[PDB]
Ligand binder design. Sequence first.
Ligand code: TTP
Ligand code: SF4
Ligand code: ZN
Lengths: 1010, 66
Amino acid sequence: RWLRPTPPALDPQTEPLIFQQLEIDHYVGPAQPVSVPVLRAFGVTDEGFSVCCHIHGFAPYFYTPAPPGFGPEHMGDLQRELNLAISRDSRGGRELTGPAVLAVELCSRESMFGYHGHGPSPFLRITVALPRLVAPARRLLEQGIRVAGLGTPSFAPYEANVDFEIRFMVDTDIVGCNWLELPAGKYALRLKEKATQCQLEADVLWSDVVSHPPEGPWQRIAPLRVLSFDIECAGRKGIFPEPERDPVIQICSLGLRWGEPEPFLRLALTLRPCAPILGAKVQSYEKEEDLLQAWSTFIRIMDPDVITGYNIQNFDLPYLISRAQTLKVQTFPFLGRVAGLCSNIRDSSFQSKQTGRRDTKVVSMVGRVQMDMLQVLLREYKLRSYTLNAVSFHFLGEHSIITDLQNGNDQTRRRLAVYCLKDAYLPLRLLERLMVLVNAVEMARVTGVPLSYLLSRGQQVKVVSQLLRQAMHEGLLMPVVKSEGGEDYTGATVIEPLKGYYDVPIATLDFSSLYPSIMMAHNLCYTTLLRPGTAQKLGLTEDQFIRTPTGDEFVKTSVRKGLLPQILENLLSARKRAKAELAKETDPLRRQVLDGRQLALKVSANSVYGFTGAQVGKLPCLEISQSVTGFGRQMIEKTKQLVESKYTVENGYSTSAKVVYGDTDSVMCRFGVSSVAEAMALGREAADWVSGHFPSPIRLEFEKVYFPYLLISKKRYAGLLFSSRPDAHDRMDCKGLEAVRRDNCPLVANLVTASLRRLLIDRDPEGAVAHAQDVISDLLCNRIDISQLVITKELTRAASDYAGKQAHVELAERMRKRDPGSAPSLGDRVPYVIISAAKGVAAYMKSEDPLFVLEHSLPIDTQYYLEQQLAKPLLRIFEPILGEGRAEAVLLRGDHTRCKTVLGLLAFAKRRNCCIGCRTVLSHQGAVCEFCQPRESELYQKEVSHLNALEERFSRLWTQCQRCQGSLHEDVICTSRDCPIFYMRKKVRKDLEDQEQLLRRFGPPGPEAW
Amino acid sequence: EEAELELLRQFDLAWQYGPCTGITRLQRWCRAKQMGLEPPPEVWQVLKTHPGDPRFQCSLWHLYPL
DNA sequence: TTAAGCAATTCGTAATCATGGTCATAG
DNA sequence: CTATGACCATGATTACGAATTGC
Ligand SMILES: Cc1cn([C@H]2C[C@H](O)[C@@H](COP(=O)(O)OP(=O)(O)OP(=O)(O)O)O2)c(=O)[nH]c1=O
Ligand code: SF4
Ligand SMILES: [Zn+2]
């Protein structure tokens, strides 16, 4: 629809180009100037034109040591290494490499690993023509033949085999989303006859570019173009949609320029004639071929930078591609920027111990960038459900019906289009509100990796990139060590608690950035690790090296500076600047998203240390990891000895303090005073006192005062939070307990939060007992919503769940009769509830889908929920304040309240009536019993105040759907399984149905036909 | 039949007769006739040549827990 | 060709081991 | 018609894997 502005008057012999790049690309090419791999770079100007840039003359290489013989110091054998062996038996050694310009170069460099000296050594630099020839050469120089005139006897290892685009960016100092400049007279626009579809197309040599480091005025962001879209399909009853039978009926698109607070384009393409919508364009077609063609032409002409959505990768784009393949439309799958290239669906998997394992499809688009917001949420955030409704409530606050809204009239289709446009608008709001893209651009500028790697890869490519960028400045080469496999080492210490309930303030002192500052201030690195022999026979121990608790020796900083101290120092300053910016916000959600930014930079700095100990990886050095955790243990026991030893009764102070807890970075010391001001004063004195026994940047700091405190086990405690004194209290802290885990029911987590509220804030155990009694009583009397009963568990890799029978695996692998095409896959979460049956050996035989127990009305196992979900967390919490008469107090609270329980063949009812007063079954329909007949005015009085309260609950719920829907004049259709509103509006109809019929036992209060 | 099942499905979604997914089909036909909006005399003449069948004398979504 | 670490607590299922109610037949 | 231990049946203890959170 709307086009980019027109590039007026660029003349290359006088004017430069200044543009900001988004994507890079590799390309094997003809039309050479009179190398074959030429590079592509796509970007945008400071105004809004689209620029493609072709870069020429770059070829991959690596290094290898020159062996000590008469060969690789003699030029005849250098060019003979270039020369091929013409023998017949060298077909395995000069064919797959063959005649390639590997070349011969002599340079003086060093290896990374260890500390041998300040002296370098000769290495050979071996270029290669193509990037897809470094793999057979590696298969032909190490295990292949290297008998060539006795120049290089096998073997010499390969060093610095890295990726092509990463080697380019390490070479020329270009980072992700960078400002690039072509100077005047260096670039030719009309040398390249147009093979792509951008406006400006330059054709430059790889030594002409200028990279501007992002800082000062070069810290801006260009006006990018962002698209979001959503589709609709018309299915059958029960049957989930399939790309060979179910047509695509509506596509809806939103588009904006980045930096402007509203969109500028709003389009909706439908398949029958429709009705107009104010604010958007509407076009209609009588066939699906025209609809797919129209969308492909719009996406070529608008030419967006970024494409977003929600689950567009695994649902939307391959559905469109398969549907275009079935209907024989040849011109659809050309969505990219290159004019002669069609797109294809390709599977990929990712797995780690940090995010688990996920299997995704990818679809190829060259030039353009994809950001599915579902994958960003699934990677960064740990939530309970990952539906669009659930995250839109958590962050903002909100198939067979559609097939008859489309086979109807045109106002129904207009309603369908407004629904689809709201769906297509929600991920834009989430992208701009959560500060996604600004943090992605800052991550790519601090680490130096492209913008497509932050959605596909892990935390290794970034630390490899930063280490290579720091390695070119002193002249070192990296080695290739690979081992399967070493052993584990010893991790962190935890101090033994003094368990219980405390009501005198405890002050928390901890170290900030512990492991990066250990690695900084004792000069630990790959490049300064001293081997056990190379100290000998030199004898200089003092101020030349140090010794660690695991046992290594490491050189002092008066000889070398390591590489990991400098990378860590850069990351630490970036996080410090993020916190300094975060210290001046007032909005809460903005404060937590800047907390998210600084959390991400601290995770990056700690993954630098975790790179060293990963024995399945790219470069492990477990000696360093052992030295780190040994220093950690030594320093925390130093802290505990010092804190408990100095402030004592004989040293003039009030009370000898005693440490109650410590977990590898923090110390919770109990001081003795019950005044929060005096505890805060002595705690600040203690933190600042103890910090002066270390190198720098090692510092201990005061952080909080808990008052009161509740310590249950290791990694399980709770307390109340004081930041200042006249800032009285902030909130609770629930470390580890049953309120922050997601393996349980909402009922149990709510009861634990409410019990700690009534028990820590108001200090009333009697209201707490009465609360827990009411929860158990309302459980047994069958008046608890089934939202509070849903359990969710993650469906991981299928073989570990083959090894032992679980409940959620049994529910998932059991398909439905309605739909063998929508079922949980690997990596998602399965929700279930437990119904009552008589198979007590197996709780995996009583699990059912919440919607299935909704539509089929199966009962609930209240004894399962009473003794297996609720009871034992309560016995954790309520015991330490009292004795074991407290277990008997809650099991007796239960006992006064356990005696109140509410209740094929089911069709053959008799429906025996019963007396309302004393429950005696009898013949006739009158409500009262003959012995309890007098007391009837009181028994009518009783239960009409129950009908009165059910009437008041019907009306508050069924008009809330009208305000959440938007309209007051049309029907509600919302079966949202993540809304408490749904199925709480279903049971009050039946309560009212039952309670209205019980009062017609009594006669009518008058006539009605008068 | 199979042509009489689309006439009723077309009467059920025309907005000028009312917002009807809680009641029967013949009750909505007589409600519009009282106010006399314009009920057509064909959605009546198939609700008379049938008995109490639940796929003629019921709204489209008379399943569906809404 | 691809993947940052360790410590600790909780719950469910099958298997191992203890103990009583019938029973079957020798006295 | 009546003792005795062999036989079936039901409940208490231990072991180990899976899931998830704290540093
Ligand atoms: C959270 C976390 C901690 N650690 C280690 C490194 C840390 O130095 C040590 C302390 O944990 P943390 O206190 O969580 O982190 P931190 O001390 O480095 O930073 P800050 O005080 O500002 O919050 O625990 C990891 O190795 N990986 C991790 O993911
Ligand atoms: S059931 Fe009602 S309140 Fe709940 S999400 Fe649906 S429309 Fe909104
Ligand atoms: Zn009675």
